[PDB]
Each structure stands twice: as structure tokens, then as C-alpha cells.
């Protein structure tokens, strides 16, 4: 059959950890003792081998800077437990509570795994306050450490009430089992009772045997601790020194005991391809139709580009025709192989909650999504803000033409966030993106790794539009110079469309008019048109109402073109009577700050034409928020470090459009256009 | 001598040394709070008085309060700190207790045989445990605490400590805002530790000398003069560090911190002479003792710029006496100097001055060519206090205002920036006369820029980065310097044959030796034929590039007994320079930077093949726990956009720094592009 394991022995995970955390040593440790890529699939029968069934672990590589937040938020759909990774000496740091949000975004239940408890400054219960007064969620420890820094041996398996030493003999890849030292025997029972108290909420049954004084069994209180795990109100913490060898087998039992199987939790979300307004959802299960999101695309010297897809319903095999929903394109599925750690197995049928790399796919995006043609469904689709910063781009020579366009190609394959556009009024490529470093990035890859030599011009903001009055306009085209003519002709209203909304919302008032319904759409179309090119600046309006409540009719001359140029004309007008103005992107910024800088930073970011929002206080920081437009917003990073000594961090993400002051509007509406 | 207002013993030259966190603000705005009354203007270096939290002292000591900069890597301006503070308050969190970033300015202050106190400040926050420090300091830093206090009551529960000298417990009065305290007795919950802490202080205070030794080894209780006069002994030796306590925020304990200053910190007198060099010959090593006597010398520590106010040179007296009106030398310019009006900078007014005695320290007004780092002296007896080793910029950018009319301003602004970092230079190219600022790398000008914008409120746009050559001869050979003109009534004559050669791997500058003595060419002239050469050498002679370092040797020349002039000599010896052009074999030079990159494992692969593909050689390197140190010599040319490279290609998981190493011929595909723009 096509189902090889049950699915109830998969482990989708991913390593959150962030710098000077412990990733790869982590990571590289994981991959050992399970032999005793965007994605890796490896086997665990337990640290002693103590479960029936062999689990299938596959090991999801996520991103090592919140910086990129929609590649972080695929990775946490993609995975289905996480293991958050911390350092005992660091703990929790503010690039750790912003994935921590985004996880609990998306439900994820998780495992905290407190690393380098070696170094100094190492304090496992010290962190766990930490997860539960700043990331404000349950940390229940299922273990101790044994033995502080240097003098770091192991831990004190709370589940079994026994010490837990690692021998260096096999590499900590076996250990040893004795009583608990007196000096934290005391200590250990204390931190067993909010264990077992923790896992006791999660059902009536355990909740009845706890409240009648009865023991729970070990069973019990794992099956506790893993229903509160899945429904993601506990965090189960546990310790370690993967440096050492010494924790990390217990941290993969861990992932089996507490962490979900694809089909324990809730079913995906989508849309249908047709409607963004319409949510559909994919059960984790083979029956159901099937439906994959490609959420890397990497590339491989042997077998070339390889597109990782996450199957969440149905199955997908070698031969099938599934189709890109998001480019409304059919695909032929051809060889399929999953990456271990040092084999490649090749597969031709992946079924629900497993992933598999795609060979030889023609025109698949990261972020796009593969599904049955008869059910199809898009499971991420916009919810990007369009870009807000661009740089013009020219090759020094027609070499570098070509070498560009084939890298816009490939990088615009990996990241989706980016767009590129030829600007016909100075014949230079633009590429827009997220932010400066966003553009850095696409810009330094293009010129180390495909040789691409060409000029680049200063950052821009990409400003957008909007009107205010509330006028009447006549679209008017009319030629019949011989004995052909062209007749379009429609009066239009304009008004503001309402904050929030995109596009145009139209409306025909003249339903069966004299203009007849056949060209109405061709209106709307010459509206939208103009739109793009923008009225005031050359830069196209955010949203837009428009309403046909007039118009005349040519029994020879009136075609489509025609009402959609005379829209257009109409449109055209709005730059006097709509009295636009200019827009420019506004950003959520948010710094954490030691209180001895909050002052400098607060007149900073106002000095910015920003706006000061509610502050909060954490535990030694104060967090100061506010709303700044991007193009006071370049250099942040070098400003808040010479400020702060580099003791400061900031974030910031698009929020909304804002109409831009007079003294930047005035010169820019003047720049080319009057 | 009148000059001295106050005995020299009665001055603490002190400075708060404090990692990120500890209290550093909070406990520095609450200093001046109790020294005013036994907001507040920021300076670098603040006097106060302190004649004790209870006024116990006979005399009235003088505090100089130095602002240090506290970063976490160990750069030239913390070093420069602690050659300024005499004493220093290293004051750490009793929650986050000793952090490795403190252990590296903790090692430089022992260089300097810095005497120090520990103020174990936060002992209100949870996970504060003030023993738990003290070890620390003994096991991580490995230097030897002495606790003269210990804590009453931890975290939410504390209230004060107790005074092991006079072994009675102090608690603060909020009512005064714990500027006064009360002497109660020692909690019996404590009594058993006091007495164990105090047997090792006394046992710490009786190793400061024979006497004190052999009265303790006789079972004689130390009396408390006796056990402070050793504490105080061992601290300006060096050999312990009194530790105290307390809560600079709920304003307890911050008052007999002062007081351990006068108790254990010491004058400027009792610690050792500084050192420095003559301003002629680096090798030969000076000092100045901290009298009034001595020959003056002054070190300006730091150069307050405003884009309103007057720029402030706040200079160290170790020696002698800065008086107004008096010709100072400006050894590392080698320029004079005319002190003007003089101000120290109280709590709240600027009280002003005209002699800064040793050991004092003063900020002086309208200084016309001071930067930081800079030593003033007597012309007579000159010395230089800290060389700068700083290596010239290796890189340059155009600016240019966005708005010309700020052009002027502009100029005023980079000038004083200059002032602040030796290390950023500012020039007109008289070629183009567009404005060049150079420094250390892409981060170093970006700083500077951001810095003209915020500070000096002045908006400007950069050209993409520039290598700052250098040129070099290879080629020994005697050129002819010819300077002769009769315009008829009036005659020039400058004539002078001149050996040049590459000048030794270490020396830069030239390196002048006259040899025609007794030879037709006056001793007069001499000096000009060298500042000929000086002033080519500038200018270049490949492609218009500065020269790194040469020797030259006058070994013949001519002489008119009225045509020659110093003008002609210095115009024919710039010429014999152009000429090393084509017979000295001159070569472009370009700056090779020491690059040292920690990245994971994972991406080592990655970073070798990039620093190799810019031109780079790849040097031996180590395994830290942090990641694998990889190191490389790379041409700063190949290095721009460096830190943009390494974040993409390591996802910003590694980090890396560069220095200049030495400079190295560039090749000719670049080169023969330069050497054929500059004609």
C-alpha cells in the first residue's frame, strides 16, 4: 500500500534556537546518535531503545534571524512540534520572544531544552522563570541539573526520581542510572509536585486520582503532560550540554513522549483559489484530498534544484498531475527523495504529515502550494504587504543583462517577498523588497553568486496614492476619421475607498442602461489601469470607489478598447478634481532598551516624524514602541548602536500608509510629473 | 606654588567602572546628589566634594569623577580612561554578579596597577546574593576581595549592611533620601557571620606590613585606624579590592561607598610616576612624577564638541602646572600652544580657573589644534604620554550636503568630529575640491556620518568607498635637485644631490641623514632641503599618493653667496622627490587588513572560498566554543560590503572584525588604471 508507517510515529520538528544558543552543535548532535538540508528525516527508538515502535523524525531546519518573519512563520507551519532551544547562562533574549509569539500564532506545541549549562553564568531554574514571567507562558521542568558550570554532570529525571550521569565512554551516547544526591533530593520533590499537578489538569480522570491522594503512575502523568504539551498550555523543560554529550538522547525521548504526531494537531487553513475570502481546511489524512506547500527550494550539484514539499492531506506520488493553485498551472510529479543524514533514499509516494524533495519542477515558488485539480486550495496566499522599499539596478555591460535576469529568476524562486520591474521612463531594472537589508541581501547574492556586475542607486521609498474629493468625471474617446470610428464614452463618480481595502471597489448603477453590460467590465478594467500608473506622482493608488451612473452608446463604433480607454481619460482627471495626495509607507517599530538610554531612543524615533505609542517594562528593559515612516527609519541599526553601545536591539515591520508631510510630498510631486 | 589651593593628598581622581546593567547612570546621578548637599550637567570628568556621610573627616577631599565609557570589547578610549582615574568603583549587579565582558577591562585596569573597590550595587533585585559576587571576583577575575560589609536582609527584604570596621549594623532613613543612616546592633541571625568576614579582613589588612603582621601573629586586636591604614596599604598596592554593598536606586549604602574612596582609594601622589616617550625618539622611554615641581605634562583625555556651545579639551595634569596665558608644546603635533580661559566642570555651574595643579583636572577653552589623545607639555622638557599607533585611514568617501547651503556648517561639524577620533581625517582634494572624509573601514565613516546628522544636525550623502593608497621606492639611487633662476636684477639658487632608499620594515616617516658635513651647502639650509622631501613625499610621485616611508641622505649640492635661499634648497629637494618617479621604480601600495571571522562549522567552507575569491590568504586558525575562529590577510579594497556577505551567506549567525597588518604592491590591473588617471 502506499502508507509505510503509521502516521501516529512521525515527529515533524524544528531547532528554534538563536545565536550563542547552540544550534548546529544541537543540531549535529541530533543527527549522531540517531545513525546509532532544508529538511532531514532520521529514526529514534529511545535513548535505550525502550519503545515498542521505531519514530520517524523529520528534522526541519528553520531560519537563524527573526529578521525574515514570513520565513519564519512557514517553517512553524511546516513543522508540528517545536524544540526551543536556550542558553542557560544568556536566557531568554529578545530574538527568542519574538518566534516564541509567532509560535503560539500558529499553536505549536514545544519542548524547552536549556543548553550550556557547562559555561558560567549557567542557571536552569533561573530560565525557567523567565519562560513563564517574560515569554508568559507554563514551563513545567521534568528535570534538574546536577552540578553548576564547569562542575555540570546531568540531570534528575523527575518522571523516574533518579540522577541521570552520562559516560564519556561511547560519546554521552548511553548513561547511567542512581539516587538522587541528598543535597537535591529536597529540591527535586518540591518541582515533582507542580510535575505531576501540571499533568493532572489535564483530564478529569488524572484530576479525580490526584484530588483522592492517589500516586499517578509514570504513564499517567507522561499521558498528562503530553495533552497539555499538544494542546500547547505547558512547555515540558529539559537540560543539557550538547558540547558535553550529556542530555541530548533525553531531549529526543522528550520528542516522542510530549511533542504531536501530524494528525494530533488542528488541520490546516487555506483558501480557495478562486476566492481569498473563502477559508478552507486539509485533515491530516491519506483519504482526504491531497494538498502540499513548498516551503524551501534549494539547489543540489547532483540531482539540481530540489523543491521540499509538506504534505498535509492526501498523498502525493511519481506520475501524478497535481496543480500549482497558486499559479493556476498543472505539474507532473517526477522523481521524489528524502534527505537523511548521510543516505539520499529516493521514494515515490509521500504520504499526510511526511515530507520529500521534487526534482525537475518547472515553476514552482517557495510558498506555493500543490493540491488535487478536481478539490484544489491555497494554503499561503498574500497577507505579505507589497513591497516598500526599492533600488534601481543597471548592468555595466549586456553580459550582465542576461546574468541579472537568470538570478532575478532563481532568487525570485526562494524568496517570494521580493518583486523586479523594468521602469520604461529610464530603462533601468527595479528591484523592491522589505527593507534595506532585505535588498542588500538580493543584491550580494547577485554579484557573488552569479557574477552579476552592475550599478546600483540609493534605497527609495515605494510611495503610493489616494484622493479625498468626491467628484463627477466624463470618459470621453471619440475618432472616426474615414469610414471606421471609435466610440467610448461613460461618466464616472469617484470617491475615497475605505482604509483597509485594496484594489478598487466598483459598482454599476446603470444596470441595464444604455451602455450596454458587455463593455462595463472594460470600464473597471481602464479604472484599474490608471490606477497602477498612479494621478499625482506617478505612483499608483492604494484603493479607489468608482461607480458608472451615466454614459452613451455607438451601434458601429463602441467596442471594449474604447470604454476602456475613455475610463481611463476619466481616471486621468482625477489628478485636479480627486485632489491626491501622496502616501508613504508607515513602520511598527519596537526597541528594547536598557531604562538608561529610554530617553535618547524616545526622541530619536519622534525626531523621526514617528509617533510614541504605550511602552511596557520587562525585566531590565524597557520596551519602546512606535509608528515611523520607512524613510526616516534608514541607518536605524548604526544610529541605535552608537546611542546604545550596542546594548539596544530594535525590529519594525509595515503597519499602514500614511499621507507624507508637505515638505516631502511638495518636492517628489514636482520631481518629475506638476 | 600659591597656585595649589589644596593639599595634593586630599584629591581622588576616581571613575565608575560598570558593565551594561549594573547601575552605572543611577549610581553616577546619585554621587553628585550627596556631594551637593554633604538637573545635573553631564562632562567628562565632574569635581564634587565629600567630607564624609557623617562628616568624620578633617579635611574637606576633592573628587574628580571621571566618565568612562564601558564597552564591552577593550578599545584605545577605555585604556585612555584608566591611565586619566587613579581609583576605580568597578561596580557589579549582585543578581547578574561577574560577566565576562568585565574580566577584559578588569585584566587592562591590573596593567595600569589600577587600586580599586567593589560596589556590589542591586542588592533589591531578585537573584541578588552579595557573597556570591565576592567569589567571583576571587575565582572568574582572580584577584583577592576584601568584604568590609556584608547584606541585611536579601532582595525585597533588604534594608542595609553592616560596617565590619566598627561591627554595627547601618540602616537608612528614607526620609532625607538616604543621605543620613542609623547605628544599630548587629542582628543575632548575622552576628556569627560578621564575626567571620571580619577575621579575614583583619587577617587580609594585617599582610599589608611587618608591623601589623607580627602584632596579629601576637593575638593583639588591630585597632580600626590600624586595620584601615593596611586595607589602604594593599588597595594602592593593588593586592585586594575592599568590597561594599548597596542600592543606588532605593538610595542606600551609595554614601559609605564615598567614604571608602577617601578610606582606601588613593591621591595622586601614591600611585606610580606615568610613562611616555621623547616626542624625537620613541625608544626612549620618560616619566613625570605628580608634583608641581616637575616639568609640565598633560594628557586631553576627551574633546567635548556641541553644534552650540564651545568645544571643551578636557586635559589630565600629572605634572607640574597648566597655567592661563602660558605657551604649552603640543608634542604629538609638535606645534605651540597658548592656554586660554580654563573651567572645571561642579554639579550644576562651571566654576572657572587659571592653574590646573598636578593631579587636577580642567577643561580648556578655544584650543586651535587639540585631539583626543594628545599630550600638552613644557617646551623645554617635552614628552609624549600615549603614542598613536592608530594606523592612517585605509579608507575614504566623498560627502556632500544635501542642501549646499549647509556646506559651511558641514565643514565646522567633520572638524569637530576629527577632534573627538583621531582615527577620521577630513580634507579638500585642491584637485576637485570635494570634501573626503577617511577612517578605519565602511562601519567607522557610516558611524561618523550618523553621528554629523544626529549630534550636528547635518544631512549628507557618501560616494561608494575608496582605498587609500600608498606608494613605496624599491630602487637606491643619487638624484640631482636643481633649482636656478636669475630674472635679472634678482637671483634663486638651490642645488643639492640626495641618495634615496626604501626607509627600515619598522620606520615610517622619512628618515633624514645629513653627510656633506663640512661640504659646500650650509647648515642653514639643511632643515629646508629635508622639508622638501617631507612635503613630496605627501604629494606622492606615482599617482599623487603619500609615500609610507623613505630614506634620504644629502651627500653633495652647490652654494651662491646671494642667490641661495631655504626656499630655493626646498623647491630643488621636492624636485630630486618627483623624480623618484622614474629611478626610483616607485610602486602603488594598497592597505592588506587582518581579517578574523567566527562562524559555526557549518559554513566554514563557505567564508575560506570568499576570503580566497577576494584576493585573500588564509592563515592559521582556532576551534572556540563559540564557533570556528577562521583568519585570513584580505586588501581592503576586496573587503567592501563584507559584513552584508557574511550575513547572507551564514543567515547573520557569524560575526568578524579587521585590522590593518601592513600594505602591499596592488596589482598592476588596478594600478596601471590609477597611474594613468593621476597624469
Same mark, same amino acid.
Given at each position: 500500500?502506499?502508507?509505510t508507517?503509521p502516521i501516529e510515529?512521525?515527529?515533524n520538528?524544528?531547532?528554534?534556537?538563536?545565536?550563542d544558543?547552540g544550534?548546529?552543535?544541537?543540531?549535529?548532535?541530533?543527527?549522531?546518535?540517531?545513525?546509532?538540508?532544508?529538511?532531514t528525516t532520521?529514526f529514534?527508538?529511545?535513548s535505550?531503545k525502550q519503545?515498542?515502535?521505531?519514530?520517524?523524525?523529520?528534522?526541519?531546519?528553520?531560519?537563524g534571524h527573526?529578521?525574515?518573519?514570513?520565513e519564519?512563520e512557514r517553517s512553524?507551519?511546516?513543522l508540528?512540534?517545536?524544540v526551543?532551544?536556550f542558553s542557560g547562562?544568556?536566557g531568554?533574549?529578545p530574538q527568542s520572544?519574538?518566534?516564541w509569539?509567532?509560535? @503560539?500564532?500558529?499553536?505549536?506545541?514545544r519542548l524547552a531544552?536549556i543548553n550550556k549549562?557547562?559555561?558560567?553564568?549557567?542557571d536552569?531554574?533561573?530560565?525557567?522563570?523567565?519562560i513563564?514571567?517574560?515569554?508568559?507562558?507554563?514551563?513545567v521542568?521534568?528535570?534538574?541539573?546536577?552540578?553548576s558550570e564547569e562542575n555540570?554532570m546531568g540531570q534528575?529525571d523527575?518522571?523516574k526520581m533518579?540522577?541521570?550521569?552520562?559516560n564519556?565512554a561511547?560519546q554521552?551516547?548511553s548513561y547511567r542510572?542512581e539516587e538522587?544526591?541528598?543535597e537535591?533530593k529536597?529540591?527535586?520533590?518540591?518541582?515533582?509536585?507542580h510535575?505531576?499537578?501540571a499533568?493532572?489538569?489535564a483530564n478529569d480522570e488524572?484530576?479525580?486520582k490526584?484530588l483522592d491522594?492517589?500516586e499517578?503512575?509514570?504513564?499517567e502523568?507522561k499521558?498528562g503532560?503530553?495533552q497539555?504539551?499538544?494542546? @500547547?498550555?505547558?512547555?515540558?523543560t529539559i537540560?543539557?550540554?550538547?558540547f558535553?554529550n550529556?542530555?541530548v538522547?533525553?531531549m529526543?525521548?522528550?520528542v516522542?513522549d510530549?511533542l504531536?504526531?501530524?494528525?494530533?494537531?488542528?488541520?490546516?487553513r487555506?483558501?480557495?483559489?478562486?476566492?481569498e475570502?473563502?477559508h478552507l481546511e486539509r485533515?491530516?489524512?491519506?483519504?482526504?484530498?491531497?494538498?502540499?506547500l513548498?516551503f524551501?527550494?534549494?539547489?543540489?550539484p547532483?540531482?539540481?534544484?530540489?523543491?521540499?514539499?509538506?504534505v498535509?492531506?492526501g498523498?502525493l506520488s511519481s506520475? @501524478?498531475?497535481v496543480?500549482?493553485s497558486?499559479?493556476?498551472?498543472?505539474?507532473?510529479?517526477?522523481?521524489?527523495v528524502?534527505?537523511?543524514?548521510?543516505?539520499?533514499?529516493?521514494?515515490?509516494?509521500?504520504?499526510?504529515?511526511?515530507?520529500?524533495?521534487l526534482?525537475?519542477?518547472?515553476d514552482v515558488t517557495?510558498?506555493d502550494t500543490?493540491c488535487?485539480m478536481d478539490?484544489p486550495?491555497?494554503?499561503?496566499?498574500? !497577507?505579505?504587504?507589497?513591497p516598500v522599499i526599492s533600488?534601481?539596478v543597471?548592468?555595466?555591460?549586456?553580459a550582465?543583462?542576461?546574468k541579472?535576469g537568470?538570478?532575478?529568476?532563481?532568487?525570485?524562486?526562494?524568496?517570494?517577498?521580493?518583486?523586479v520591474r523594468t521602469?520604461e521612463?529610464?530603462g533601468?531594472?527595479?528591484?523592491?523588497?522589505m527593507?534595506?537589508l532585505?535588498?542588500?541581501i538580493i543584491v550580494?547574492?547577485?554579484?557573488?553568486?552569479?557574477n552579476v556586475?552592475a550599478n546600483?542607486?540609493?534605497?527609495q521609498?515605494?510611495?503610493r496614492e489616494?484622493?479625498?474629493?468626491?467628484?463627477?468625471?466624463?470618459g470621453?474617446?471619440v475618432r472616426?476619421?474615414?469610414?471606421?470610428?471609435?466610440?467610448?464614452?461613460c461618466?464616472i463618480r469617484?470617491?475615497?475607498?475605505?482604509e483597509?481595502?485594496?484594489?478598487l471597489?466598483?459598482?454599476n448603477?446603470?444596470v441595464?442602461?444604455?451602455v450596454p453590460?458587455e463593455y462595463?467590465?472594460?470600464?473597471?478594467?481602464?479604472i484599474?489601469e490608471?490606477?497602477?500608473?498612479?494621478?499625482l506622482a506617478?505612483?499608483?493608488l492604494i484603493?479607489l470607489?468608482?461607480?458608472v451612473?451615466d454614459?452613451?452608446?455607438h !451601434?458601429?463604433d463602441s467596442?471594449?478598447?474604447?470604454?476602456?480607454?475613455a475610463?481611463?481619460?476619466?481616471?486621468?482627471?482625477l489628478?485636479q478634481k480627486g485632489?491626491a495626495v501622496?502616501?508613504e509607507?508607515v513602520?511598527?517599530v519596537e526597541?528594547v532598551?536598557?531604562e538608561e538610554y529610554?530617553? !535618547?531612543?524616545?526622541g530619536?524615533l519622534?525626531?523621526?516624524?514617528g509617533m510614541?505609542?504605550d511602552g511596557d517594562?520587562?525585566?531590565?528593559?524597557?520596551?519602546?514602541?512606535a509608528?515611523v515612516p520607512?524613510?526616516?527609519?534608514?541607518?536605524?541599526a548604526?544610529?541605535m548602536?552608537?546611542?546604545t553601545?550596542?546594548?539596544?536591539?530594535?525590529?519594525?515591520?509595515?503597519?499602514?500608509?500614511?499621507?507624507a508631510?508637505?515638505?516631502?510630498a511638495?518636492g517628489i510631486?514636482?520631481k518629475?510629473?506638476?
Open positions: 500500500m502506499a502508507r508507517t510515529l512521525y515527529r520538528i524544528g531547532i528554534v534556537a538563536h545565536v544558543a544550534k548546529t552543535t544541537t543540531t549535529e548532535r541530533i543527527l549522531f546518535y540517531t545513525g546509532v538540508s532544508a529538511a532520521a529514534w527508538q529511545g535505550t519503545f515498542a515502535h521505531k519514530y520517524r523524525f523529520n528534522i526541519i531546519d528553520t531560519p527573526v529578521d525574515f518573519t514570513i519564519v512553524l507551519r511546516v508540528d512540534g517545536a526551543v532551544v547562562a544568556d531568554v533574549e520572544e519574538t518566534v509569539r509567532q509560535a @503560539n500564532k500558529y499553536h505549536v506545541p531544552y549549562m557547562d559555561r558560567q553564568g549557567a536552569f531554574l533561573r530560565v525557567v522563570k523567565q513563564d514571567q517574560r515569554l508568559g507562558h507554563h514551563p521542568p521534568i528535570q534538574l541539573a546536577i552540578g555540570f534528575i523527575l518522571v533518579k540522577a541521570i550521569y552520562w564519556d561511547d554521552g551516547t542510572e538522587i544526591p541528598a537535591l529536597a529540591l527535586a520533590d518540591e518541582w515533582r509536585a510535575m505531576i499537578e499533568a493532572a489538569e488524572l484530576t479525580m490526584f491522594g492517589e499517578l503512575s509514570i504513564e502523568i499521558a503532560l503530553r497539555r504539551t499538544i494542546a @500547547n498550555e505547558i512547555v515540558p537540560l543539557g550540554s550538547s558535553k550529556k542530555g538522547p533525553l529526543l525521548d522528550a516522542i510530549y504531536p504526531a501530524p494528525s494530533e494537531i488542528p488541520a490546516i487555506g483558501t480557495d483559489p478562486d476566492d475570502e473563502k485533515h491530516a489524512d491519506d483519504k482526504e484530498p491531497f494538498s502540499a513548498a524551501k527550494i534549494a539547489t543540489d547532483f540531482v539540481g534544484t530540489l523543491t521540499f514539499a509538506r498535509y492531506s498523498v506520475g @501524478n498531475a496543480l500549482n497558486v499559479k493556476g498551472k498543472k505539474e507532473r510529479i517526477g522523481r521524489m528524502q534527505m537523511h543524514a548521510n543516505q539520499r533514499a529516493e521514494i515515490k509516494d509521500v504520504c499526510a504529515g511526511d515530507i520529500a524533495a526534482i525537475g519542477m518547472k517557495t510558498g500543490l488535487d478539490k486550495i491555497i494554503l499561503e496566499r498574500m !497577507d505579505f504587504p507589497d533600488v534601481a543597471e548592468p555595466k555591460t549586456k550582465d543583462q542576461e541579472m537568470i538570478a532575478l529568476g532563481k532568487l525570485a524562486q526562494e524568496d517570494p517577498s521580493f518583486r521602469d521612463e529610464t533601468q531594472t527595479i528591484i523592491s523588497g527593507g534595506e532585505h535588498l542588500d550580494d547574492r547577485m554579484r557573488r553568486e552569479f556586475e546600483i542607486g540609493k534605497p521609498v515605494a510611495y489616494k484622493i479625498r474629493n468626491t467628484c463627477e468625471i466624463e470621453r474617446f472616426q476619421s474615414g469610414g471606421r470610428g471609435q466610440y467610448g464614452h461618466w469617484f470617491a475615497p475607498g475605505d483597509g481595502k485594496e484594489g471597489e466598483f459598482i448603477e446603470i441595464g442602461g444604455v453590460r462595463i467590465p472594460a470600464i473597471q478594467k481602464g484599474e490608471q490606477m497602477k500608473n498612479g494621478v506617478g505612483y499608483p484603493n470607489k468608482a461607480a451612473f454614459g452613451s452608446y !451601434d458601429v467596442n471594449e478598447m474604447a470604454y476602456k480607454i475610463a481611463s481619460m476619466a481616471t486621468k482627471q489628478s485632489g501622496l502616501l509607507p513602520m511598527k526597541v532598551t536598557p529610554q530617553g !535618547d531612543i524616545l530619536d519622534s525626531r523621526r516624524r510614541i505609542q517594562e520587562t525585566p531590565a528593559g524597557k520596551v519602546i514602541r509608528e520607512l524613510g526616516e527609519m534608514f541607518g536605524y548604526t544610529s548602536r552608537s546611542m553601545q550596542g546594548r539596544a536591539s530594535f525590529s519594525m515591520e509595515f503597519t499602514r500608509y500614511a499621507e508631510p508637505a515638505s516631502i511638495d510631486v514636482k518629475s510629473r506638476g
